[PDB]
Write a structure and sequence with these properties.
It contains 9 helices and 9 strands. With 263 residues, it is of the alpha+beta class. It has one domain: Beta-lactamase (3-Layer(aba) Sandwich), CATH 3.40.710. Strand 8 and strand 9 form a beta hairpin. The structure holds the ligand *[B]([O])([O])[C][N]C(=O)C1=C([C])ON=C1C1=C(Cl)[C]=[C][C]=[C]1. GO terms for molecular function: beta-lactamase activity.
Length: 263
Amino acid sequence: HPETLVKVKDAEDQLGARVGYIELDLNSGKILESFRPEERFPMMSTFKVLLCGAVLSRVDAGQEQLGRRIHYSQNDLVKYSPVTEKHLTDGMTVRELCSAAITMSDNTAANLLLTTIGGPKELTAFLHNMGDHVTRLDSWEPELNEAIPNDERDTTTPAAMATTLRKLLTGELLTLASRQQLIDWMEADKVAGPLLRSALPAGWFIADKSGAGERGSRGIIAALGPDGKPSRIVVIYTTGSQATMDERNRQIAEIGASLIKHW
Ligand SMILES: *[B]([O])([O])[C][N]C(=O)C1=C([C])ON=C1C1=C(Cl)[C]=[C][C]=[C]1
């Protein structure tokens, strides 16, 4: 809706950074609204949803089990790993790792899951193999690149990410069970409260994943809708900014308030 683009443009000026935005109809996959849809932005933690998509694809092929337990040690821990930090003694199953990587943006959880599939290169291969030749993960956490446009490592575009997310939540790429599990983990997201969720009315459904960069980049991918069910996919990314985190969060929340008001 035009009013949402107003807030997106306001955000660019307020943040002194570029903002990428796209909203897709969940059923048809058609672009309902967009801004800088084909420009590249650092994916940051939003890649964790795609990673678990790759893991679920392996589960569907009988190459992985959600209940499989992975043991690890202190040497595997990296910053921003609130859940994995507490399971050095008993380990965590694959589903617990995806839950942690998605809902708490747990870095070590993401790395352990990356290891199960063969590394960043295999996540990129997984994406390439499903028709996404844009999105690329080149690094392990906590080292993702943010230096665009010179360096395109670890980037995506609003359009590529939205299209890919839709292909992981709908259609036949993943089984019904896997599609449902992926959106269920996203619905349980615990660290995206100041973003789209802050503007969400009671009774609305939202399944999302946030991202943040050391240089100030911020982003979010989501499937949301009224009456307790999702009907649109929204992806929002912002380049590096000198603006404070509170300000970055507020701008994204403002965009969401408009999206909701003019649904
Ligand atoms: B992912 O992007 O969510 C993982 N990384 C971060 O969240 C992050 C980065 C890249 O730089 N700081 C953070 C961070 C923030 Cl802003 C809040 C809480 C934990 C980590």
